């Protein structure tokens, strides 16, 4: 089937920035594409349609070129609102396949995370199961990992986590994982550790502690 | 490849139900939607209804609704219908088609399948009579003549396929509740009597298989 | 409903209008002796990938039109609305002799007291022939599709008599009247 | 002005049929050219298109769901339905039904690359799990601490610290799907170590619960 590569799919910028998207397919696609900015809990936006057409009551900001197999969206000024996410839709072929994504949040100087074990509650271990959860709080970039031990031993497949949204003021990240072991597991171990990897550390930095 | 294989022939008497299959392959059978068409002798092309080939889901033709019956089979990727109180009206070509990925259940076409003959009637199956044609005491015409037979269809070829060129097999033609069928082969006149020229004409409806070599009068 | 109409049924430009207006839900397909159609164009003129450029499906709304090896019915196909109808459909060189052959009847057919006589007009064009069997009704006469290759017609008439009916006459023939008649007997 | 609305069920079991419709005003079925499309997306995913009916009752369906998906308009009732049948775990999404433009006409004649007006989205969840609440464990130790609103379904499930007084480092992040079918987020707080009450609420099982952390 019909593919459309968004490039890039992630990036930095500054307020009254210029930054440029682009939308790949593999066949040739006319001038049927449109793209959208959606923003979390609100549906996507229509911005530039027909390729190059721009929208009613949409911004300047916003232009849209390209034909063919490749066009590309360019915000002259970034204003604070375009700080989300924008898709591309071709309506040539069916299905009206539609991209990627591309993230675009804010530019801000490296912010290495601040590493927050926790054990598992009691309260907890008396219903069979035991939660360790580990906290990196007000990072940057939003890529980072989180690698559980327990006594040396390199956990995978039985952790979880969650990230939050770059805050309003802080502009930065928080990742909240989550280790869940059987009680019976988690008794017998005792050295459990967590350790995080993020471009803001000279090293990798492990925050354990002891049953 | 996709491919959609049709069951072979059937002879009903009218009031008899027959039931049909249409086995795919080359592709996801639970993707698509198969539809049946009918095809009177005259050449016309009726819509029957269509399957939905995942759910099961159906719809019919208000014509042939009552009478016509849909099934399908997931483990063995096969289409069918149940054709009920049948006439002579139904003595048609039954073929079974395909439709195109996000149209839905509606069409084009893309593929169809063999396509099967049915022939509806009270006449009772006769085996046919093969008969060697050779000319009358620098290309020859032989031949062979498949009279007095029911129903259709007949198969019949040359040297076991070997002869393709110069052959000619015309439709068969009804003679009250009964088939004849001819064939003829332009070969050069060296090739026989000198090498041998027979001509194989099977029967399916009574199993019957005869081969007939053209020797000279 | 939405009635489908071809037009002409025998004679590239093919007519196919309907009853109700509809979008350009409109497939055509071709379909050759002895095995079932081909997918040509789908809805709204679209060359099913594989077929020659020389095909194209203009039209919309309730008229349309469709402009060796294209010897066969063409049939359209309304993708509109249910019942899916099509048409009546369609079937679509220099002249040539037909070579006659006469036969006389097998030994295994005298055995059971038949007796036919056939005669082959093979590759001739056009298919308009007339066959005078002519003896010193009781005839059947078939004629084949139109040759996909050499485009040319042929035909086998079977005179069908009685073992004493063909044992009281010694002399059969077969005249062919095609664009001074071909004879043959024995 | 040109208006959508998704309607459907919020939940729905394995296997069974999901019956989605979408209300709008500003525009009739009537008009030429225009058309009314599908749109999903999964918690966190990307947008996928579904399906889009048009005026003319033309109808295309996602290759992936061409025999799951069906969809239908209302001309007279102003709506578009779809219908999706045997659904799973992975159908669970938020559903959008935008409005296409139709082409520019000529006395009937066309001489609508986007989706202009989307819908306000519909949230479904495809799970066969029953209603239960949450249990809150404390996230006990400048200096952080939290509660981990475990096991419970379906979301959403509002997190609160102190009253209100709380907001100041409070990171509430937001659910994850475990192998049981249950959810599980966790709410933590960063404050002055010197310095040294989640007001949880889970609407559906009426399950509140205002626990402290030592």
């Known amino acids: 089937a019909l593919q459309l590569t968004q490039s890039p799919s992630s990036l930095s910028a500054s307020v009254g920035d210029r930054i440029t998207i682009t939308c790949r397919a593999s066949q040739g696609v006319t001038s049927a594409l449109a793209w959208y900015r959606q923003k979390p809990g609100s549906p996507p936006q229509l911005l530039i349609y027909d390729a190059s057409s721009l929208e009613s009551g949409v911004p300047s900001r916003f232009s849209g070129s390209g034909s063919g197999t490749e066009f590309t969206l360019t915000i002259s000024t970034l204003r604070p609102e375009d700080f989300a996410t924008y898709y591309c839709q071709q309506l040539h072929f069916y299905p009206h396949t539609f991209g990627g994504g591309t993230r675009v949040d804010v530019r801000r100087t490296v912010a290495a995370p601040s590493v927050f074990i926790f054990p598992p509650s009691d309260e907890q271990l008396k219903s069979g199961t035991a939660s360790v959860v580990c906290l990196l709080n007000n990072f940057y970039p939003r890529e980072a990992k989180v690698q559980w031990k327990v006594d040396n031993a390199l956990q995978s497949g039985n952790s979880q986590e969650s990230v939050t949204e770059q805050d309003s003021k802080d502009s930065t990240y928080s990742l909240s994982s989550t280790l869940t072991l059987s009680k019976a597991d988690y008794e017998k171990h005792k050295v459990y550790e967590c350790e995080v990897t993020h471009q803001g550390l000279s090293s990798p930095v492990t925050k354990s502690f002891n049953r | 490849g996709v491919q959609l294989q049709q069951s072979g022939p059937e002879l009903v008497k009218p009031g008899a139900s027959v039931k049909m299959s249409c086995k795919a392959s080359?592709?996801?059978?639970?993707?698509?939607?198969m539809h049946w068409v009918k095809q009177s002798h005259g050449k016309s092309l009726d819509w029957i209804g269509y399957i939905n080939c995942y759910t099961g889901a159906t719809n019919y033709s208000q014509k042939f609704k009552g009478k016509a019956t849909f099934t399908v089979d997931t483990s063995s990727n096969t289409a069918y219908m149940q054709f009920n109180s049948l006439t002579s009206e139904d003595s048609a070509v039954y073929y079974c088609a395909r439709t195109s990925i996000g149209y839905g259940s509606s069409p084009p076409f893309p593929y169809w399948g063999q396509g099967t003959l049915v022939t509806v009637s009270a006449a009772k199956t006769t085996p046919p009579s093969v008969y060697p044609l050779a000319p009358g005491s620098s290309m020859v015409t032989l031949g062979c003549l498949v009279k007095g037979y029911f129903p259709e269809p007949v198969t019949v070829t040359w040297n076991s396929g070997s002869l393709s060129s110069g052959v000619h097999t015309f439709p068969a033609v009804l003679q009250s509740d009964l088939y004849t069928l001819s064939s003829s082969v332009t070969v050069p006149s060296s090739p026989r009597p000198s090498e041998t020229v027979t001509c194989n004409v099977a029967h399916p409806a009574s199993s019957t298989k005869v081969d007939k070599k053209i020797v000279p009068r | 409903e939405t009635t489908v109409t071809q037009s002409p049924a025998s004679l590239v430009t093919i007519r196919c209008i309907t009853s109700?207006?509809?979008?350009?839900?409109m497939n055509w397909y071709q379909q050759k002796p002895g095995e079932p159609p081909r997918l040509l164009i789908s809805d709204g003129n679209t060359l099913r990938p594989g077929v020659p450029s020389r095909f194209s499906s203009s039209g919309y709304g309730t008229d349309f039109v469709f402009t060796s090896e294209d010897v066969a019915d063409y049939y359209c196909l309304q993708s509109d609305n249910l019942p899916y109808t099509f048409g009546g459909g369609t079937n679509l060189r220099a002249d040539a002799a037909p070579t006659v052959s006469i036969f006389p009847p097998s030994s295994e057919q005298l055995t059971s007291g038949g007796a036919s006589v056939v005669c082959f007009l093979n590759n001739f064009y056009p298919k308009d022939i007339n066959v005078k069997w002519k003896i010193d009704n009781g005839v059947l006469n078939s004629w084949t599709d139109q040759d996909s290759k050499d485009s040319t017609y042929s035909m086998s008439s079977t005179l069908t008599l009685t073992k004493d009916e063909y044992e009281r006459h010694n002399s059969y023939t077969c005249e062919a009247t095609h664009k001074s008649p071909i004879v043959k007997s024995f | 002005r040109i208006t959508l609305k998704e309607s459907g069920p919020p939940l729905v079991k394995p296997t069974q049929t999901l019956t989605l419709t979408c209300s709008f005003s500003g525009f009739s079925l009537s008009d030429f050219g225009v058309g009314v499309g599908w749109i999903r997306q999964p918690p966190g995913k990307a947008l996928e298109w579904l399906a889009i009916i048009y005026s003319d009752d033309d109808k295309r369906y996602s290759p992936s769901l061409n025999t799951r998906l069906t969809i239908t308009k209302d001309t007279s009732k102003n709506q578009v339905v779809l219908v999706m049948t045997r659904v799973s775990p992975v159908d669970t999404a938020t559903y959008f039904c935008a409005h296409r433009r139709g082409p520019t006409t000529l006395f009937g004649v066309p001489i609508v690359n986007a989706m202009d007006v989307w819908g306000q989205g519909i949230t479904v969840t495809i799970s066969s799990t029953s209603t239960k609440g949450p249990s809150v464990f404390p996230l006990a130790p400048a200096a952080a601490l939290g509660c981990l609103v475990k096991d419970y379904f379906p979301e959403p499930v509002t997190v609160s610290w102190n009253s209100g007084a709380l907001t100041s480092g409070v990171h509430t992040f937001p659910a994850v799907l475990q192998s049981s079918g249950l959810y599980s987020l966790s709410s933590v707080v960063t404050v002055p170590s010197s310095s040294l009450t989640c007001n949880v609420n889970h609407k559906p099982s009426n399950t509140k619960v205002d626990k402290r952390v030592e």
């Open positions: 080359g592709y996801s059978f639970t993707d698509y939607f």
């Open positions: 109700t207006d509809i979008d350009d839900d």
